[PDB]
Amino acid sequence: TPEVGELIEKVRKAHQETFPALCQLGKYTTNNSSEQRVSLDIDLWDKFSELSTKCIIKTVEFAKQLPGFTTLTIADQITLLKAACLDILILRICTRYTPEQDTMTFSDGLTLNRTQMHNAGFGPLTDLVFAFANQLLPLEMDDAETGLLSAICLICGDRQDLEQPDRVDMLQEPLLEALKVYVRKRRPSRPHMFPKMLMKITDLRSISAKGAERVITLKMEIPGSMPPLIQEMLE
Amino acid sequence: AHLILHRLLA
Numbered sequence: 001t002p003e004v005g006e007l008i009e010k011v012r013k014a015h016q017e018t019f020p021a022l023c024q025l026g027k028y029t030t031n032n033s034s035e036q037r038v039s040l041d042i043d044l045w046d047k048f049s050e051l052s053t054k055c056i057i058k059t060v061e062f063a064k065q066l067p068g069f070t071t072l073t074i075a076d077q078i079t080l081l082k083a084a085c086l087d088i089l090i091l092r093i094c095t096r097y098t099p100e101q102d103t104m105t106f107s108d109g110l111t112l113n114r115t116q117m118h119n120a121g122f123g124p125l126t127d128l129v130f131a132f133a134n135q136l137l138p139l140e141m142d143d144a145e146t147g148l149l150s151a152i153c154l155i156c157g158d159r160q161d162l163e164q165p166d167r168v169d170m171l172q173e174p175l176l177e178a179l180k181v182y183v184r185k186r187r188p189s190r191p192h193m194f195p196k197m198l199m200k201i202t203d204l205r206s207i208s209a210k211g212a213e214r215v216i217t218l219k220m221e222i223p224g225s226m227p228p229l230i231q232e233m234l235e
Numbered sequence: 236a237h238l239i240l241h242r243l244l245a
């Protein structure tokens with residue numbers, strides 16, 4: 001029930017405090033398979049899976065700061081986090097896209113080009129993920145918009161096996177209303193911005209469905225096992 | 236069991 005301005009600031013702060021921006025980071029690169037496409041580069045996969053584990057921890061920290069999220073049953077908090085895991089991780093890595101070099105930057109500064117993202121584990125998802133990063137760029141979204149989009153993605157009453165889906169639908173409504181007033185207030189000259197941002201949630205769900213298929217094939221390909229926190233989210 | 240998740244959430 002908070003006022004729109006209060007909800008926006010809470011969500012903006014939840015995202016900013018769990019997501020360093022590309023400008024804040026000390027970018028660095030690696031020579032590992034930078035110019036050769038391979039099925040799986042194990043050194044990149046080891047680094048990528050470690051950074052993904054860290055991003056999951058930051059995603060849970062973000063969710064716990066969203067108003068009313070911790071009031072849902074623990075079973076529903078878990079169902080929501082599992083279902084939105086890939087959506088939020090993909091939105092986050094795509095937020096750090098540099099188009100001139102066609103790279104994405106991780107939360108420690110590691111900057112990978114398209115071939116290296118392919119080799120790290122993206123595989124067949126690579127072009128869809130980079131296409132999404134390119135669609136996001138002209139929107140010029142800020143921390144409040146990215147945080148609200150992540151929150152709308154997470155607090156979704158249509159996820160399978162929710163105990164209280166109508167409660168989740170009710171919690172999402174104020175987030176959608178807040179994004180609408182914020183986007184219009186911030187940029188009144190662009191009246192089509194809000195529906196364009198909502199369409200990114202649909203694109204993202206399609207990519208995350210393909211991502212769940214990729215987890216299956218990667219499980220057969222990696223030499224060891226998936227890290228425990230990744231397994232909890234995706235299996 | 237979602238052991239780690241339970242820990243992060245509680």
Ligand SMILES: CC1(C)CCC(C)(C)c2cc(C(=O)Nc3ccc(C(=O)O)cc3)ccc21
Pocket residue numbers: 048049051052053055086089090092093105106107108121122125211212214215218230
């Ligand atoms: C489906 C596939 C290929 C396999 C399963 C895992 C490894 C979970 C994965 C992870 C991501 C992902 O985006 N990870 C991110 C890692 C770190 C940051 C950051 O530092 O900001 C952001 C995102 C995408 C796809 C997949």
